[PDB]
Design a protein around this ligand. Structure first.
Ligand code: 5TY
Length: 113
């Protein structure tokens, strides 16, 4: 494993901890959610993000953050605001961006020198 992969796996584990029912663990199918493929054209989930880390597909934390944001945005686009999926996506997007904030990454950059 590489230092980037270890850091991204840590961020992903902490993010997955906020989803105990595993709503974001797997891709959303049309059988589970009707007309999903018709509304969401750029699907994303924690499993796809895990596979990208393992394959060393992320060049930076910004790229990882972009996939996480896409996943939350998709859930907030497809699902109405009063659903468990929209509510969890909004909660984890905020919590995730504070964990991977420019402030926290600058503090990590300073500890790398
Ligand atoms: C059952 N159903 C209608 C439905 N709809 C939307 C979603 C969804 O966005 N995620 C992320 C996970 C499950 C899900 N399930």
């Amino acid at each position: 494993s590489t230092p980037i992969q270890q850091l991204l796996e840590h961020f992903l584990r902490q993010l997955q901890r906020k989803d105990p029912h595993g709503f974001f663990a797997f891709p959303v199918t049309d059988a589970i959610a009707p007309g999903y493929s018709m509304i969401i054209k750029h699907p994303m989930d924690f499993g796809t993000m895990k596979d990208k880390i393992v394959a060393n597909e992320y060049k930076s934390v910004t790229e990882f953050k972009a996939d996480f944001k896409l996943m939350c945005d998709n859930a907030m686009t497809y699902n109405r605001p009063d659903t468990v999926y929209y509510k969890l996506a909004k909660k984890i997007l905020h919590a995730g961006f504070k964990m991977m904030s420019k402030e926290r990454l600058l503090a990590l950059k300073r500890s790398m020198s």
